[PDB]
Design a protein around this nucleic acid. Structure first.
Ligand code: ANP
Ligand code: MG
Length: 377
RNA sequence: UUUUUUU
C-alpha cells in the first residue's frame, strides 16, 4: 500500500507496471523531505531504490502544480548522472511514471537534432550527463535559469575531480550565493563520505535534511552479496575467469567482469575463454554500439559483459547474479559500487575478486574499509 | 586510471 504518502491513483497504476506496490525504506524515509521542498543528502546501499526516492515525490510535486505546457518551455528539474547509460536508465524512472510531463535525456555520442527538437517542444524534466548539457547551455539553446529542483545522482562522483568543475559551471547558471530562490538540492549515493557532505553544503540551504540508512559499524556493501576472492597470476586469470563463470553464475544468470583499463576490458572480451558469450563496454566503444551492447546484455542476447567502471555505478540489471573484479581496486568506493551490480532489491548475488600475490595488500584494504571478509576459495 | 560536450 501507499497510504502514508500523497501518490495519486494514476501514479500508483503506472508504478504497478514497474512492479512497485509499496515504498522501499529509502523511499519511505525521504518522500516527505523531497515532496515538501527541503534540501536532502541521502545515503543508502546499492540496489535499495534511490532512483524512485527522488523520482516519485518529484513527479507528484510537479503533477500538483499548474503545468501549462507552453512550447519551448525551460526545464523545472535537472538530473545529472556520471555515465550515458545511467542517465538513460534514470530517465525512464521519470518517463514510465508520468503521462503529462515531458522528460528529456541529453548525453554525448548522440545526434544533436533530436535534442534541439525536444528543446523547441519544451522540457519539464531534464536528465543527462554534464558534457552535452554544458554544451547546450554554451550554444545558447538550453535555459537552466528556471530550475526548481536539482538531483545529483552518484553525488560523490559528480563532485569529485573529473566532474566538479563541469558540474559547478552547470549549476552556476541556476544557483547564486546566499539565496532562497535557489532550486531544491537533492543528493544521493551508496557512498557519501564526509568530504562529499562538506562540498555539498555549498549548494544546500541551512534547512537541509540528512538520511543515512548505512550508518557506522555496518557493512558498506549490499547485505545480500557474498564476497569471495581467488588468488591467481595474471597469466592464468582469463582461463580461471572462464571456469569461474561456468559454475558460479546460475540458470539464466548474467555476469559482469570489471577491469581497470579500456585496453584490459577489450582484450579480455576477445580471449577465447569467454569471447563466445561476451561483449565489452567502455569509453572507446562508439555510443551506438554501447547502447546495443547494453541492451543485448539486459535482454539476455549474451551472458557476459566485460566493462570498465563505466558500468560500475547505478546500472540495474536484475539478472546479474555474478560480478567478477579482475583485481582489488585501490578505491574502496569502486569495489562497493561494482559489487552492487548484483544483489539488488533483495536478491542474493555473488562478487568474486581476483588478486595477484602482490595485490593482497589491496584486497585486505577493501575488506577492512568496506566491513566485509572475503572467503578465499 | 576511469568516466564525462566536440573530434
Ligand atoms: N518500491 C519498489 N518496489 C519494487 N521494486 C523497486 C522499488 N524501488 C525500486 N525498485 C527496483 O529495485 C531496483 C534497484 O533500484 P535503484 O533505484 O537502481 O537502486 P539504487 O539505490 O539507485 N542502486 P545504486 O545506484 O546501484 O546505488 C530497480 O530494479 C528498481 O526498479
Ligand atoms: Mg542509483
Amino acid at each position: 500500500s501507499f497510504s502514508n504518502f500523497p501518490i495519486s491513483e494514476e501514479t500508483i497504476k503506472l508504478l504497478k507496471g514497474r512492479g512497485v506496490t509499496f515504498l522501499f525504506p529509502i523511499q519511505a524515509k525521504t518522500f516527505h523531505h523531497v515532496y515538501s521542498g527541503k534540501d536532502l543528502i541521502a545515503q543508502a546501499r546499492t540496489g535499495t531504490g534511490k532512483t524512485f526516492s527522488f523520482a516519485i515525490p518529484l513527479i507528484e510535486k510537479l503533477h500538483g502544480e499548474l503545468q501549462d505546457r507552453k512550447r519551448g518551455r525551460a526545464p523545472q528539474v535537472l538530473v545529472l548522472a556520471p555515465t550515458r547509460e545511467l542517465a538513460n536508465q534514470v530517465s525512464k524512472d521519470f518517463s514510465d511514471i508520468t503521462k503529462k510531463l515531458s522528460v528529456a535525456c541529453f548525453y554525448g555520442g548522440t545526434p544533436y537534432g533530436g535534442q534541439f527538437e525536444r528543446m523547441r517542444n519544451g522540457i519539464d524534466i531534464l536528465v543527462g550527463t554534464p558534457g552535452r548539457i554544458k554544451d547546450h547551455i554554451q550554444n545558447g539553446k538550453l535555459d537552466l535559469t528556471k530550475l526548481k529542483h536539482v538531483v545529483l545522482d552518484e553525488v560523490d562522483q559528480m563532485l569529485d575531480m573529473g566532474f566538479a568543475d563541469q558540474v559547478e559551471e552547470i549549476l552556476s547558471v541556476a544557483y547564486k550565493k546566499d539565496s532562497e530562490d535557489n532550486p531544491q538540492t537533492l543528493l544521493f549515493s551508496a557512498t557519501c563520505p564526509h568530504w562529499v557532505f562538506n562540498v555539498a553544503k555549498k549548494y544546500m540551504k541551512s534547512t537541509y535534511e540528512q538520511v543515512d540508512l548505512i550508518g557506522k559499524k555496518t557493512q558498506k556493501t549490499a547485505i545480500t552479496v557474498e564476497h569471495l576472492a581467488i588468488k591467481c597470476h595474471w597469466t592464468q586469470r582469463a582461463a580461471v575467469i572462464g571456469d569461474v563463470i561456468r559454475v558460479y553464475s546460475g540458470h539464466q544468470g548474467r555476469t559482469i567482469i570489471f577491469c581497470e583499463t579500456k585496453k584490459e576490458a577489450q582484450e579480455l572480451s576477445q580471449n577465447s575463454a569467454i569471447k563466445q558469450d561476451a561483449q565489452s563496454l567502455h569509453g572507446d566503444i562508439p555510443q551506438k554500439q554501447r547502447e546495443i551492447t547494453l541492451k543485448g546484455f539486459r535482454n539476455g542476447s549474451f551472458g557476459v559483459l566485460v566493462a570498465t567502471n563505466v558500468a560500475a555505478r547505478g546500472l540495474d540489471i536484475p539478472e546479474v547474479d555474478l560480478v567478477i573484479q579482475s583485481s582489488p581496486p585501490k578505491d574502496v568506493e569502486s569495489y562497493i559500487h561494482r559489487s552492487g551490480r548484483t544483489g539488488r532489491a533483495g536478491r542474493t548475488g555473488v562478487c568474486i575478486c581476483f588478486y595477484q600475490h602482490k595485490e593482497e595488500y589491496q584486497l585486505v584494504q577493501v575488506e577492512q574499509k568496506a566491513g566485509i571478509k572475503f572467503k578465499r576459495i
